Design a protein around this ligand. Structure first.
Ligand SMILES: N[C@@H](CCCC[NH3+])C(=O)O
Ligand SMILES: CC(C)[C@H](N)C(=O)O
Ligand SMILES: [Ca+2]
Ligand SMILES: [Ca+2]
Ligand SMILES: [Ca+2]
Ligand SMILES: [Ca+2]
Ligand SMILES: [Ca+2]
Ligand SMILES: [Zn+2]
Ligand SMILES: [Zn+2]
Length: 316
């Protein structure tokens, strides 16, 4: 909408106060004009028609319980935009400052979130498996990263290419969580999953097997559930990424860690320069090796660590 840029204040899903960029024209709208062609947050009003209505508020204060998922979807989309721009020199998900759109209050008791090809969508959860899913910065950044993948490598969402697609979203979701630097970890979804259970999460990158996901190619899932295991076999790649950054010895193979920033540079370059829609795990290894070679040189520790990490998870 046409209006003037304003700054509202509200409380997110976890009870934290934050400022949000809004637009004033009669109402205050969740429309942030400070980033690219805008970040726009919509109310789906417990239905499944998308996007719903651009979020309107009478007073620019967003402290109602109903407001909290919208505050966080809007704010964390901004953090994610900032990460890609500041760290990778990428302007929005398409590289050309495309508007970022999110809808909250999708359906009733909906225990998921997604990128639908055009926008992000967040359920409220049922209050037991999940609370509103936009409360997790790693979740928001995971979903927006699917848009980045859409516009770059285009990894088909099935089998190994789909597991890479998922792992890319978990990797960058985690790197955005570290960028914001509020209670960062190598777990996925911990802030919004199972409010009655402390210390759990949806997936773990540091130890995928904690939640039943493979941490070695020999343990990959080969069945048809979950589009051929895209959220299961992602553990093999998540573990490799964790090892590249943090180091460790895994099934007897030692990896020298090179840190999160270099992990992000290597995988961003692989995603945008080398991966294709049909890339498999072996082709990801080759893409990561070539990316690290471009950035750091063939004789570098960074290249050696990429190779050790893929060896450790059984990907040749
Ligand atoms: N986002 C993942 C994990 C489940 C999230 C809620 N059931 C999926 O759609 O499979
Ligand atoms: C729920 C979220 C983490 C994502 N849509 C899965 O995985
Ligand atoms: Ca208000
Ligand atoms: Ca109010
Ligand atoms: Ca965390
Ligand atoms: Ca996390
Ligand atoms: Ca929990
Ligand atoms: Zn997903
Ligand atoms: Zn995903």
């Amino acid at each position: 909408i046409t209006g003037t840029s304003t700054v509202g204040v509200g409380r997110g899903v976890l009870g934290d106060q934050k400022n949000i960029n809004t637009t004033y024209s009669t109402y205050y709208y969740l429309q942030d004009n400070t980033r690219g062609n805008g970040i726009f947050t919509y109310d789906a009003k417990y239905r499944t028609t998308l996007p719903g209505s651009l979020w309107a508020d009478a007073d620019n204060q967003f402290f109602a319980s109903y407001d909290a998922p919208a505050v966080d979807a809007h704010y964390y989309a901004g953090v994610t935009y900032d990460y890609y721009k500041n760290v990778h020199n990428r302007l929005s998900y398409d590289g050309n400052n495309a508007a970022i759109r999110s809808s909250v209050h999708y359906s009733q008791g909906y225990n998921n979130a997604f990128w639908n090809g055009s926008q992000m969508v967040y359920g409220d959860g049922d209050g037991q498996t999940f609370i509103p899913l936009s409360g997790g910065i790693d979740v928001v950044a995971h979903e927006l990263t699917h848009a980045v993948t859409d516009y770059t490598a285009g990894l088909i969402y099935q089998n190994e290419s789909g597991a890479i697609n998922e792992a890319i979203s978990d990797i960058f979701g985690t790197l955005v969580e570290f960028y914001a630097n509020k209670n960062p970890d190598w777990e996925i979804g911990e802030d919004v999953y199972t409010p009655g259970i402390s210390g759990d999460s949806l997936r773990s990158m540091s130890d995928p097997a904690k939640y039943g996901d493979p941490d070695h190619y020999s343990k990959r899932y080969t069945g048809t559930q979950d589009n051929g295991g895209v959220h299961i076999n992602s553990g093999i790649i998540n573990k490799a990424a964790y090892l590249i950054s943090q180091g460790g010895t895994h099934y007897g193979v030692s990896v020298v860690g090179i840190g999160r920033d270099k992990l992000g540079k290597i995988f961003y370059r692989a995603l945008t320069q080398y991966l294709t829609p049909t890339s498999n795990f072996s082709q990801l290894r080759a893409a990561a090796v070539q990316s690290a070679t471009d950035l750091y040189g063939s004789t570098s520790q960074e290249v050696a660590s990429v190779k050790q990490a893929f060896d450790a998870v059984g990907v040749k």
